[PDB]
């Protein structure tokens, strides 16, 4: 672990905190944004920035050149996490479905796009970049849509066939689903027939997509200024939010990798990626749907602080 | 002229119209955003994105390698538009000072920060970038401050030290002022001593500044949707606002360019930049001070529509 490699991690993490700070200061000390305005900014982030980012992620990779072992391992990890959460909730802590979503939003949705590429590139070779790209594409194609479907189903519940039909009806109009579908279609078209996206469309998409992550962090800092303080999540809930993200998710990912027989850099990069801090998109969704938005906030705040400790610990463990 | 050039300009301009149309549809038709949410988004873009973009543009300029001929041309463009507005108003339309500010907020304040770099950097490549950034620096450092002082003087007119003090107090709480000062200082340091911005700070600034143009157009579209109609005022003061920007301003700028003997790209760019539609800061000042906010809004809304039609015309004309 070269000392100059810690500089890379810190440089990848600090910018995601500068915007968050700016937002917190604007909301609390400057009293610049009212709660309605913060909700509107978050809605813009969730409706225009995230769909375009997902489209770009999905439309810039080879759908037919993708490690199937990586896909199977990710699916197995997600299924195992869902099963474990369902089993635990049955005996621990009504409103059980609301906690299954809040578990997947802090367990099986890392932030490999921002904090993953630099950390893995510094600690591993170029192949890790491709593996992380594939993981991000999968989580922005399948998992980010399944999470939205679950959110819609939870909102509708607040006779079963009617609820499912309502959830599907509300999902089909969601920008994220259409963005993902168009992204996959364009990816296959461009990588089979060689079609290239016209410049007037690529630039238009980039203009809105660009700066979306800064806006998401701004919204995260804005929402954290309307809570009790910085750990409004609580004391025990904040402690378990990290055992779910750095002690259970990584273990289940290791189990999935063992089951799928991963033996390559597709192992030391497939497991380490699962120990990275939480993403911002899960918060962007959990605050628009108002499903425990305080639990996926302190987790984000305190996950990028311990990213380096836990990541280096897992790196040492894998080598041993 | 070749159709390829016309197509290049159209492609450069299309994304900035797609963002505006998306914002307008989201506000009015799709009804994603409530008026409070739209106001919050406008405040965010005007407080965090625009100042950072201004700082970046200013820092990407060389104070010691400016063009004094361009400086003089820009100062004489806004000094004989005053001598043409103080003479016409003598024989046309009490409120000479009020109308002069409204006449200056239209003719000689192009939007060279949001809609000037993209279009012109594409029409003439990267050569025009230096000229546009120099003009942006000048209008952010001198002309906006003078406009603020004139607005304060008009407000107090319906001693001088009190007006200057009020202008200074209101100028210190403006993010644009701090952004411009810091950008000038950093450009001086970088281009004299050779210092380089740290990677962390650069990435943090880019996180928010990247989306400062697409989101600016989105906010413009939201504002257009907020207004009741395109032509808020009457035709009498609507067919004159366009002629005060696409006929009088460019003509008086061509006169300045001939007096100062500007030649080459510094001419085809120095006149073309004056034909761009009006900015939004003058509208903000007019709304805050309530100085004819129904004409400065009409101009800003009806120039964004016919910018490309009236920009291709000047592009074709100047080639001869
Ligand atoms: C050197 C750092 C100077 C920091 C300047 C801050 C000074 C603090 C000001 C104190 C005066 C008290 C009044 C403060 C109000 C302005 C706040 C502000 O101005 O806050 C930054 C601004 C956002 O203000 P606001 O709109 O949110 O609220 C302000 C509007 N109202 C008042 C309505 C809420 O917008 C921005 O982000 C500005 C972005 C451009 C500045 C980027 C600085 C980068 C640093 C460059 C220098 C680097 C040198 C190399 C050295 C490297 C090693 C260290
Ligand atoms: O540069 C300009 O004159 C216009 O750019 C803007 C566009 C939208 C908003 Cl809110 C603020 C600004 Cl300054």
UniProtKB/Swiss-Prot annotation, chains A, B:
Expressed in veins of mature leaves. Strongly expressed in pollen. It is a multi-pass membrane protein. Residues 1-5, 59-68, 121-130, 202-204, 263-265, 319-320 are extracellular. It is found in: Endoplasmic reticulum membrane; Cell membrane. Disruption phenotype: No visible phenotype. Increased frequency of aborted and misshaped pollen grains and decreased pollen germination. One of its GO terms (cellular component) is plasma membrane. Optimum pH is 6-7.4. Changing residue 77 to A: Abolished auxin (IAA) transport activity. The keyword Signal does not apply. Residues 27-37, 90-99, 226-241, 287-297 are cytoplasmic. Its main location: endoplasmic reticulum. The keyword Cytoplasm does not apply. InterPro entries: Auxin_eff_plant, Auxin_Efflux_Carrier, Mem_transp_PIN-like. GO terms for molecular function: auxin efflux transmembrane transporter activity; identical protein binding; protein homodimerization activity. It comes from the Eukaryota. Auxin efflux carrier activity is competitively inhibited by naptalamate (N-1-naphthylphthalamic acid, NPA). (indol-3-yl)acetate binds at residues 50, 111, 113, 144, 280-281. NCBIfam families: 2a69. Homodimer. This is Auxin efflux carrier component 8. It comes from Arabidopsis thaliana (Mouse-ear cress).
